[PDB]
Amino acid sequence: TLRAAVFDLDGVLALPAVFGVLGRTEEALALPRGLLNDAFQKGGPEGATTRLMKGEITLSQWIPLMEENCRKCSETAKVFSIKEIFDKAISARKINRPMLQAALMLRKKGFTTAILTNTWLDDRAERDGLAQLMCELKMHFDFLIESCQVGMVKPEPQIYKFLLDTLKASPSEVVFLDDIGANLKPARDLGMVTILVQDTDTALKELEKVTGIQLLNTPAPLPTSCNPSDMSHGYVTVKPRVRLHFVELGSGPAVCLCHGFPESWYSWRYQIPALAQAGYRVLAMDMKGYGESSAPPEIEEYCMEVLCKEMVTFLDKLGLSQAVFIGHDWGGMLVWYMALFYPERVRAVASLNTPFIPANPNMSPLESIKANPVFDYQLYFQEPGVAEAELEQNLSRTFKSLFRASDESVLVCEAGGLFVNSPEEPSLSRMVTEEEIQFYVQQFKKSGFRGPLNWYRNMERNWKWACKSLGRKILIPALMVTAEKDFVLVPQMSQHMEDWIPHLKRGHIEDCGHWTQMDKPTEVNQILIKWLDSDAR
Amino acid sequence: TLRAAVFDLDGVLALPAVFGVLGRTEEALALPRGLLNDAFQKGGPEGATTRLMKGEITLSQWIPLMEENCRKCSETAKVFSIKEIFDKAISARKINRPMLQAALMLRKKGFTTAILTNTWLDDRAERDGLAQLMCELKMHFDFLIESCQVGMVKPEPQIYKFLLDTLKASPSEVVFLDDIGANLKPARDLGMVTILVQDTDTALKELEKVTGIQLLNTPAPLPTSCNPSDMSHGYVTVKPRVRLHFVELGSGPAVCLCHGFPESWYSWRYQIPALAQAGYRVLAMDMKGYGESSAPPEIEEYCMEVLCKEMVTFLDKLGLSQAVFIGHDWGGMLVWYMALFYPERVRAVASLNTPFIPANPNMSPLESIKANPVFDYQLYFQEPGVAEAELEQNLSRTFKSLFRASDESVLVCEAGGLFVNSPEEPSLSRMVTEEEIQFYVQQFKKSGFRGPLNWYRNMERNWKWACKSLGRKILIPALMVTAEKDFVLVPQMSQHMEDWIPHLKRGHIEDCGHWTQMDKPTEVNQILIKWLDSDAR
Ligand SMILES: Cc1ccc2cc[nH]c(=O)c2c1
Ligand SMILES: Cc1ccc2cc[nH]c(=O)c2c1
Ligand SMILES: Cc1ccc2cc[nH]c(=O)c2c1
Ligand SMILES: Cc1ccc2cc[nH]c(=O)c2c1
Ligand SMILES: Cc1ccc2cc[nH]c(=O)c2c1
Ligand SMILES: Cc1ccc2cc[nH]c(=O)c2c1
Ligand SMILES: Cc1ccc2cc[nH]c(=O)c2c1
Ligand SMILES: Cc1ccc2cc[nH]c(=O)c2c1
C-alpha cells in the first residue's frame, strides 16, 4: 500500500529539461549528434559532471571543465559559449504545473512527498532565477534531497537507501517518478513502484492508476494558503499602549493588507503566498483591536484619524517610505482615507467591496446612514456591550454564522440581535474548514469584540475629520474591486467614485459575496497581481 | 531658561529652499523679477497656495491653479512647465546636515525638539523622494507639525499657540528658527527666542549663544543608533523547538546581519539605521542561542551545518530567495560557509574580522588550533559548564570586561578563568554607555551562555563538514574587512583568502579592536555601504 511519492526535478517537476537543450543546441548548430551530450557525460562517475553533482565543485568551476570536454569530443569526431547555453536552459525551465498539482493532491490525501534531484551548487551571477524556482517548489513537499548536498547521486544505490530512511517507509510504500530510466532502475530493484516520465499526461495516468487517487481532469485547485505557525510574525509598537502585529512574506515593493470586521491577517491567507510569488513584500496586518495587535478599550482609540496616524507610524518604525495599501470592508475604508490624508506614504491604493465614501457636509452622518437601509444592522453595534455580549457568547457560532457565501445566509435588527432566528449550531460554509473557523475562534479569545466594534462607534468624529478632505481628489494609482453578491457593500454604491478618483481602475467579481478573499481567491489574486504589476511597480 | 527648540523645514533643515528656485527660474529664463514669486503668493490668505498649505487641496490640484496665476501675472507685466520646476526644486532639496546635527545635540542635552513647517499633501508621481526626506528627518525630533495636517499656516497666530500646547512649554522656554521674518514675528510677540536663518553658520552661532550649548566646531558625531522598543521585531519558527528573532528596518535588497560571541542583534545598532537609509532592508539577527531566539541545550544543535540549514530555512519562511550575508566573529565564519554551501541563497558575503578558514584535511582541528596560540582561550570554552559558571556569575562584570577598545584591556587561560586577575567592578569602556551594557545583561538573563558557548564545541563535526568543500572556491561577490588591533582575529590570518576567493574585495580599519561595529561605526558603515552599492545592488 502506497504512502509516499518521490519526484525528480529536471524533466518531471520542471520543463523543458536542462538536458533537452544539449540536443537542441546540437541541431540548431548542426553539430555531430550527441557531441554536447557526450562532453557533458565524460568520465562517467569520475568526470567533471559527477563531481559537480556530488557538490565537490560549483557550477562556475564546472563551466571551463565542460568547455575542455567539448573540444576533446569535437577533436575525436573531426569537426560559442557553454555558459550562455546553460544560462538560457536554466531560465527557460519552468515548473510543470500539472505535475506539481498532482504532488499537492497526493500530500493533501496523506502521502509523504519528496523531491529527489541530481543538482549543483549554483554560484552564477544569474543564480537567483533557480533559487526562486527551488524556493517556490520545495515549500509544497515534505523533503528535498539534493545530490550536491548529500554527496551522492542517482543511480548510486546508497542515495535510495538514504531516501527510504528519510521517508521512514519501506520500498513497497513508495512511488518514484523519474524521466531517466537508469535512475529509475535502483528504485525498481528495491521494490518501489516506478514511473518512467515522458509526457506528463501519461505519467499522471500511471500515477493515478497506482495510487487510486484522482489526479487528472480534477476541479481547479484553490491558491496556496498559509499555515500560521510557518509564517514570519512581526510586532511594532506605534505608541506606549499600542503594538501592531503582522505576518510578512516575500521581497519587493511593500504591500500592506488591511482586513475588515470581524476579521484577521488570516483573512488574506489565499493572497499572501500569491502576492509574494508575484514579486511583492506582503505585510498582512492584524488591525488595531484584533488578534495579536493591541485592543485598548476606549471608543476614540478607533476613530479613522487615530487609525491612519498609527498606520503611518507603523511605516515609520519599519523604515518604509511607502507601501501599497489594499483593504477590505473597514480596512477598505481606512485605505481610501490613507490615500486622502497621506498620499506621500501610499504607493497605490485598492479596496475590495468598500467604496470611497465622502462626508456629506449638509447632512448629519446619522441622517445619511439611515438613507441607506442596508446599514441598519450597524445601529445595533452602537450601544456599548450589546453586540459584544451576543458575538462573544459562542465564537464558533459567531464565525460559522458570519462566514458564508451569498446563497448560504442564516442571518432587520430590531429582532433583538444578529442571531435571533439563526441556528445555534450552523453548518460549515463551503468557503471554510472547521480548522479555519477554530483559528478565528482562538484569535478572538484574546480581546473579543470591543475593539473591533469600536471601529463603528466613531461616526461623528470620522465625519468631522472627513470634511477636511472635501476639496481634494485621490490622484495616486487606485483600484476599486466590486463584488456582485455583497448585499451591503453593493457594486452600485461605488458608481460616483470617478468624480473623486478620475484615474480609478476597476475590477469586478461575479457570484462573489462579502467575504471576497475566501469566496473568490483565484479571481482576487488575478485582479490584484495584474493591477500591482501595471500600476504599483 | 530654554527647554525646547523649533525648526522650520524649507531653508532651515533642508537646502536649497524650494523658494530659491522661483528666483533662479526667473533669472535663468530672464523673466520680469519676482513674477513667479508673485504668482505663487497670489490671493494671500485666500489664494491657491494658502489652500494647498492648509491641506484643502493636494499638490497635483494646485499645479494648474499656479499655472493660471502665472499667466495673469505675465499679462499684468506685459511679457514651460510649473510641474517640471517644482519636481526639480523638491529633488534638489537635501537635508542641511549641520542644522540637523545641532537639533540632535540639543535633544541629547534634554531639549524637546520640533519641526514646524508650511507644507502640502504630495500626490505627485515622484512623491517618494519627499516621503524619504521627511521620514529620515522626523525620526530625530519629538514633534513634526505640518500645516496641511493641522489646517493652520504660519504666520496665523493659532499655529503658535498650538505649537506651545504641543511642546507643553511657556514661550520663554522655546527657541524658534525660521528663514522667513514674517513667520518669525508671531513667535517673537509671544516671548519666544527667535533666530532669523540666512546662512547656517551664523544661525548656529546665534543658537549656541542663546542655549549655552556648543553646536559649532563639535567633534564628529557617532552614527544614529537603535532604541530596541522602537524597532520592528520579527520571529520565525525554523523547526519545532527553534525560533529565530530579528530586528527589521528599511526597504530594498535583504541584508542579513549575523553577530558574534557573546553578542546580540544590538551589536549592529550603529549599522541598522545607516544601511536602511542607504536603501537596504536590514534583518539584524539574534543568532541561535541568543537574546529572543531559541537556545536548545544540546551541543550538536550549534554545529555549522545545523546553523546554516536553519538560516536557509529562515530565508524560506520569510519568502526570500536570497539575502546579502554580513557577519562578525562567529557570525563571520557562518557567512563564509553560507557562501560555500548555499551560494544560490547568498546575494553577496562580507565578514568583519573573521577570515575564511578552510579545513586542513591532513591535520586534526585540535592540532591545527594549537598551532595558532591566540586561540588558547577557546580551550577554556570546551568543558561544559566551566565557562558558563564564570561568565553568568556577574553579567555586568562579564560585558564591561569584554566590550573594551584595544588599549582598555583588563583580561593565557590556565590562570583558571578569563577574569582571574581582572577587576570585580571594571570601568565603563569609552565605546559603551551603562544603558547599553544593561541591555546585554538583560538579554543574557534569558538563556545565559550555554548556547553561545556551544558554537565553540563542534570543532570535529565542523571540520568533517568543511572537508566536503575543499575542492570549491567562493566566486560570488565577497568582502573581507580586517581590524588592525584585533589581537585574536589578526589581519595577517586573512592573507591566504585570495587563493579561495579570487575576486575578493577588502576593507581595513586602523586602530580598531575586536568589537568592530561599536569601535569604529562610521568607518564600518562607509565600507559596507560602498561595497553594497557596487557589488550587491
Ligand atoms: C457607511 C456610510 C455609508 C454611507 C454614508 C453616506 C453618507 N455619510 C456617511 O457618514 C455614510 C456612512
Ligand atoms: C448584514 C449583517 C448583519 C450582521 C452582521 C454582524 C456582524 N458583522 C457583519 O459584518 C454583519 C452584517
Ligand atoms: C469616513 C467614513 C465613511 C463611511 C463611514 C460609515 C460608517 N461609519 C463611519 O464612521 C464612516 C466613516
Ligand atoms: C457586513 C456584511 C456585508 C454583507 C454581507 C453579505 C452577506 N452576509 C454577511 O454576513 C454580510 C456581512
Ligand atoms: C579557529 C580556527 C582557526 C584556525 C584553524 C586552522 C586550521 N583548522 C581549524 O579547525 C582552525 C580553526
Ligand atoms: C582573548 C579572549 C579571552 C577571553 C574571552 C572570553 C570570552 N569571549 C571572548 O571573545 C574572549 C577573548
Ligand atoms: C569551519 C571552521 C573554521 C574555524 C573554526 C574554529 C574553531 N572552531 C570551529 O569549529 C571552526 C570551524
Ligand atoms: C574574541 C576576542 C578577540 C579579540 C579580542 C581583542 C581584545 N579584547 C577582547 O576581549 C577580544 C576578544
CATH number at residue A71: 1.10.150.240
* Maximum Cα interatomic distance, chain B, rounded to a whole number of Å: 94
CB-CB neighbors (< 8 A) of B308 in chain A:
none
Do B45 and B138 fall into the same domain? no
Q: Is any ligand 6 atom within 6 A of the Cβ of residue B386?
A: no
Cβ atoms A432, A222 nearer than 8 A = no
Is some CB atom of chain A closer than 8 A to the CB atom of B491?
Answer: no
Cβ atoms B488, B410 nearer than 8 A = no
A250/B473 CB distance under 8 A = no
B117 is in an annotated binding site: yes
Q: Is B224 inside any structural domain? A: no
Buried b (16+ CB within 10 A) or exposed e, B270-286: bbbbbbbbbebbbbbbb
Question: In this structure, what C-alpha cell is assigned to residue A81?
Answer: 559559449
CA angle A512, A513, A519 (to 5 degrees): 65
- Resolution, expressed in angstroms to one decimal: 1.7
Cβ atoms B283, B249 nearer than 8 A = no
| Residue B263 backbone dihedrals phi, psi, to 5 degrees | -115, -150
Three-state DSSP at A485 gives coil
Close Cβ partners of A191 (under 8 Å, ≥ 6 residues apart):
A170, A171, A172
**CA A268 distance to own-chain centroid:** 9
Is some CB atom of chain B closer than 8 A to the CB atom of A171?
Answer: no
Of A384, A398, A407, which Cα lies nearest the Cα of A485? A407
Cβ atoms A186, A212 nearer than 8 A = no
Has A456 been annotated as catalytic?
A: yes
Q: Is B438 inside any structural domain? A: yes
DSSP label at A110?
A: T
Q: Is A217 inside any structural domain? A: no
Strands A232-239 and A242-249: antiparallel
For residue A56, the CA-to-ligand 5 centroid distance in Å is 21
Three-state DSSP at A361 gives coil
Do B421 and B522 fall into the same domain? yes
Method: X-ray
Question: In this structure, what C-alpha cell is assigned to residue A381?
Answer: 453595534
Is some CB atom of chain A closer than 8 A to the CB atom of B51?
Answer: yes
Buried b (16+ CB within 10 A) or exposed e, A301-335: bbbbbbbbbbbbbbbbbbbbbbbbbbbbbbbbbbb
- Of B91, B119, B153, the residue at which a domain comes to its end is B91
End-to-end CA distance of chain A, in Å?
50
Do A414 and A469 fall into the same domain? yes
Element (H, E) at B75: helix B59-77
Instruction: Name the catalytic one among B456, B486, B519, B535.
Output: B456
Of B332, B340, B312, which Cα lies nearest the Cα of B258? B332
Q: What is chain B's Cα-based Rg?
A: 28
A376 is in an annotated binding site: no
Q: Is any ligand 2 atom within 6 A of the Cβ of residue A413?
A: no
**C-alpha atoms less than 13 angstroms from C-alpha of B40 in its C-beta half-sphere:** 18
Element (H, E) at B101: helix B97-108
Nearest ligand to the CA atom of A409: 4
End-to-end CA distance of chain B, in Å?
50
Do B313 and B377 fall into the same domain? yes
Amino acid, res. B106: L
Cβ atoms A330, A261 nearer than 8 A = yes
Closest chain A residue to B148, measured at CA: A341
Do B286 and B311 fall into the same domain? yes
Cβ atoms B287, B332 nearer than 8 A = no
**CA B474 distance to own-chain centroid:** 29
Q: Is B110 inside any structural domain? A: yes
Is residue B256 left, alpha or beta, with left meaning phi > 0 and alpha meaning psi from -120 to 50?
A: beta
H helices, E strands: number in chain A: 23, 15
Question: In this structure, what C-alpha cell is assigned to residue A420?
Answer: 435571533
Do A347 and A478 fall into the same domain? yes
Closest chain A residue to B137, measured at CA: A316
| Mutation for A interface: B50, B63, B123, most A CBs within 10 A | B123
B343/A139 CB distance under 8 A = no
Is some CB atom of chain A closer than 8 A to the CB atom of B495?
Answer: no
CA distance A301 to A317: 20
Q: Is any ligand 6 atom within 6 A of the Cβ of residue B419?
A: no
CA A442 to chain B, closest CA, distance in angstroms equals: 20
DSSP label at B117?
A: E
CA angle A137, A142, A146 (to 5 degrees): 65
Q: How many domains does chain B have?
A: 3
Strands B193-196 and B242-249: unpaired
Q: Is A222 inside any structural domain? A: no
Burial (CB count <10 Å: 0-12, 13-18, 19+), residue A19: middle
Closest chain B residue to A123, measured at CA: B343
Is some CB atom of chain B closer than 8 A to the CB atom of A149?
Answer: yes
- CATH of residue A444's domain is 3.40.50.1820
Question: In this structure, what C-alpha cell is assigned to residue A462?
Answer: 470620522
Three-state DSSP at A492 gives helix
DSSP label at A215?
A: -
Do B120 and B38 fall into the same domain? no
Do B164 and B312 fall into the same domain? no
Three-state DSSP at A172 gives helix
A123 is in an annotated binding site: no
Close Cβ partners of B162 (under 8 Å, ≥ 6 residues apart):
B145, B150, B152
CA distance B16 to A535: 32
A319/B276 CB distance under 8 A = yes
Cis peptide upstream of residue A262 (ω within 30 degrees of 0) = yes
DSSP label at B324?
A: E
Q: Is A218 inside any structural domain? A: no
CB count in 10 Å sphere of residue B223: 16
| Residue A286 backbone dihedrals phi, psi, to 5 degrees | -100, 115
| Mutation for B interface: A123, A277, A341, most B CBs within 10 A | A123
Three-state DSSP at A325 gives strand
CB-CB neighbors (< 8 A) of B46 in chain A:
none
CB count in 10 Å sphere of residue B221: 12
B118 is in an annotated binding site: yes
Is some CB atom of chain B closer than 8 A to the CB atom of A126?
Answer: no
- Of B144, B177, B212, the residue at which a domain comes to its end is B212
- Of B91, B126, B150, the residue at which a domain comes to its end is B91
| Residue B146 backbone dihedrals phi, psi, to 5 degrees | -110, 125
Instruction: Give the structural domain span for B304.
Output: 231-537
Q: Is B220 inside any structural domain? A: no
Strand partners, B281: B254
DSSP label at A45?
A: G
CB-CB neighbors (< 8 A) of A229 in chain B:
237
Do B81 and B140 fall into the same domain? no
Do A343 and A478 fall into the same domain? yes
Strands B193-196 and B174-178: parallel
Instruction: Name the catalytic one among B38, B178, B286, B329.
Output: B329
CA distance B364 to B362: 7
Cis peptide upstream of residue B16 (ω within 30 degrees of 0) = yes
Do B258 and B384 fall into the same domain? yes
CA B355 to chain A, closest CA, distance in angstroms equals: 20
CA angle B193, B194, B200 (to 5 degrees): 130
CA angle B521, B522, B523 (to 5 degrees): 90
Buried b (16+ CB within 10 A) or exposed e, B290-312: bbbbbbbeebebbbbbbbbbbbb
Three-state DSSP at A326 gives strand
Q: Which single residue is written with the C-alpha cell 522661483?
A: B22
Question: In this structure, what C-alpha cell is assigned to residue B363?
Answer: 591535520
Strand partners, A177: A7, A195
Close Cβ partners of B70 (under 8 Å, ≥ 6 residues apart):
B35, B36, B39, B82
- What is the 3-class SS of A216-267, one letter each residue? CCCCCCCCCCCCHHHCEEEEEEEECCEEEEEEEECCCCEEEEECCCCCCHHH
A317/B276 CB distance under 8 A = no
CA distance B328 to B481: 9
CA distance B516 to B523: 9
CA distance B88 to B85: 5
Strands A4-7 and A174-178: parallel
Closest chain B residue to A305, measured at CA: B149
CA distance A125 to B348: 10
Q: Is B111 inside any structural domain? A: yes
CB-CB neighbors (< 8 A) of B122 in chain A:
343-344
Strand partners, B114: B6, B143
Q: Dihedral (C-alpha) A167, A173, A177, A182: value to the nearest 10 degrees? A: 90
Within A109-143, residue ranges assigned H as helices are 128-138
Three-state DSSP at A424 gives coil
Three-state DSSP at B139 gives coil
Do A246 and A207 fall into the same domain? no
Is some CB atom of chain B closer than 8 A to the CB atom of A241?
Answer: no
B318/A232 CB distance under 8 A = yes
Q: Indicate the length of chain A as a whole number.
A: 537
**CA A185 distance to own-chain centroid:** 38
